Design a protein around this ligand. Structure first.
Ligand code: NI
Ligand code: NI
Ligand code: NI
Ligand code: NI
Ligand code: NI
Ligand code: NI
Lengths: 251, 249
């Protein structure tokens, strides 16, 4: 099974490239979007935790609108990354869900990211609200200190599917080289045992960069590129990423 | 830990090095291929002597070596007779194999010879000694074209290659599952972490195994293989491009 957002088909062919916009102010968001317009990527993620007036609903709504007017032909992924999971700032559970609910309502986003450990009830209800409006859900988990056991990585991805994720997503930190292989093993076992939709997996940092290139073989449907600055350690430039993915796709 | 220098090429340092394989049945074929490989971006030229027609006729093999040398003057040359049992075109007795390799050593035209791990300990060890006496380096190899042994066994083979005096142990295996590719990488990592005191080269074959040709800098493989122009085999140019991207990440 594949996932179609805007006109992009996730789940077939080469891995798709996601890039993240980080803007403090609306002026920053518009300027970064103008700089991104021509870059070669497939999905634009707006990292809303980097945005100053996240707690002000009209500011957020305006920002999304400015992005949508500059980048008109790419699916837009709305993502508030909690400090819990390596983000720039914390919000109460209630604020977090309401922010995502407001993003769904806006009619300006194609996807929203929901963290798996947010809470089962809330996540289930927010998934429901998103689908109610044809908004897809990337469900996510990040472990910035370590790489859990392969089996644990697999059960979290399986749990995302049960919660109704259109695309499960997991990012883990390697402490050793073997940790990178653990992440790839888990991706393969997930694909073999439970996957019925695209999934996205990655090992972070310089040591896991290989994981950001082999998804076509091991099973990850997308990968994060950098336009100038990485949104998580290990991202390489968008141009180099497309070059490598194409080469491997045709290998 | 050691690096291994062949001419001006330092193996075991920085980005993995690129090896290309030249195949020719006659001296005319050899010259044609050498000419075509001349301006391509690779590091070590491996001559698959097993493709050459009458290997028991020493002078012909030697005249072909000379030709490759005259056309490709800067790159290190690796002399490789890949035996029948490991994917090679033709049979030689152990004695013939050893004599061939010593002739290549004696010629002064080659920088390195390939000796198979499974050739026979006594024979291999003396020939390793003979190559070294002549400043010729040794890549000790095992190629399994149909399956991927268990990690413990891949590691055991690599350890033995070191025990036998290889300058550079080399193993190449065929995955039947994606897991097998990860097994080869796991073996590479355990060998680096725990027993390796010299450069090692490892590779999983086919399209599924491609990561293994790209990730040598992170996981521990000192060199990789590409085409001047086969599933999972990429061009020298594309391979240099990706290795550079990974190295500068
Ligand atoms: Ni295609
Ligand atoms: Ni509505
Ligand atoms: Ni360098
Ligand atoms: Ni002598
Ligand atoms: Ni066999
Ligand atoms: Ni080989």
């Amino acid at each position: 099974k594949t996932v179609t957002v805007r006109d992009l088909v996730v789940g077939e062919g080469a891995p798709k490239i996601i890039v993240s916009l980080m803007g403090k102010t609306i002026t920053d968001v518009k300027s970064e979007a103008l700089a991104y317009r021509e870059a070669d990527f497939d999905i634009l993620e707006w990292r809303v935790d980097h945005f100053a007036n996240v707690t002000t609903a009209e500011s957020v709504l305006e920002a999304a609108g400015a992005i949508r007017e500059i980048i008109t032909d790419k699916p837009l992924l709305f993502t508030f990354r909690s400090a819990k999971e390596g983000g720039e700032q914390a919000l109460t559970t209630g604020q977090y869900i309401d922010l995502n609910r407001a993003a769904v309502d806006s009619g300006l986003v194609d996807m929203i990211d929901l963290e798996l450990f947010t809470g089962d009830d809330e996540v289930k209800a927010t998934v429901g609200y998103a689908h109610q409006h044809n908004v897809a859900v990337i469900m996510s988990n990040h472990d910035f200190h370590k790489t859990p056991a392969a089996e644990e990585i697999v059960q979290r991805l399986r749990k995302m599917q049960e919660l109704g994720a259109d695309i499960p997503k997991i990012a883990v930190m390697p402490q050793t080289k073997a940790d990178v292989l653990t992440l790839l093993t888990a991706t393969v076992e997930m694909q073999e045992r439970y996957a019925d939709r695209p999934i996205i997996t990655m090992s972070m940092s310089k040591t896991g960069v290989i994981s950001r290139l082999a998804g076509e073989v091991f099973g990850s449907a997308a990968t994060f590129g950098a336009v100038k600055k990485a949104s998580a350690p290990g991202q390489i430039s968008v141009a180099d990423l497309r070059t490598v993915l194409t080469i491997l796709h045709q290998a």
